[PDB]
């Protein structure tokens, strides 16, 4: 099964990006909170010229999955661990809040 597909029923405005790690993806994250969705992992910074920037990752986006690992319930150590270990093209499910 696609272990991440359910995310698009819980967050139907979420989207999938494919970002190649070349040295880095180009993001930082925090464990934070948003009024509309609660606590979780959010993009907190974005590196100029990076592949994440080129793929349309935005500061403030909620990070919902990394490849096949769901990050809806991940703590900071686990989410950053997933991002650091991933190689090649890294699939991220992101939700821009607006």
């Amino acid at each position: 099964s696609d272990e991440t597909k359910f995310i698009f029923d819980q967050f139907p405005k979420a989207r999938t990006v494919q970002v190649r790690k070349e040295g880095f993806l180009g993001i930082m994250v925090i464990y934070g909170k948003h009024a509309e969705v609660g606590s979780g992992i959010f993009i907190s910074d974005l590196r100029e010229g990076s592949n994440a920037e080129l793929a349309g990752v935005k500061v403030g986006d909620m990070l919902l999955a990394v490849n096949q690992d769901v990050t809806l319930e991940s703590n900071y150590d686990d989410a950053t661990g997933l991002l650091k270990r991933a190689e090649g093209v890294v699939t991220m499910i992101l939700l821009t809040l607006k």
Binding site: G26, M28, L46, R47, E48, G49
Partner: peptide, 19 residues
């Protein structure tokens, strides 16, 4: 490879620690 330090879109500062 690309440098570990890069420009923050939030602060404009050159920082490391990129994922």
């Amino acid at each position: 490879g690309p440098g570990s330090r890069g420009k923050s879109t939030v602060t404009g500062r050159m920082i490391s620690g990129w994922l």
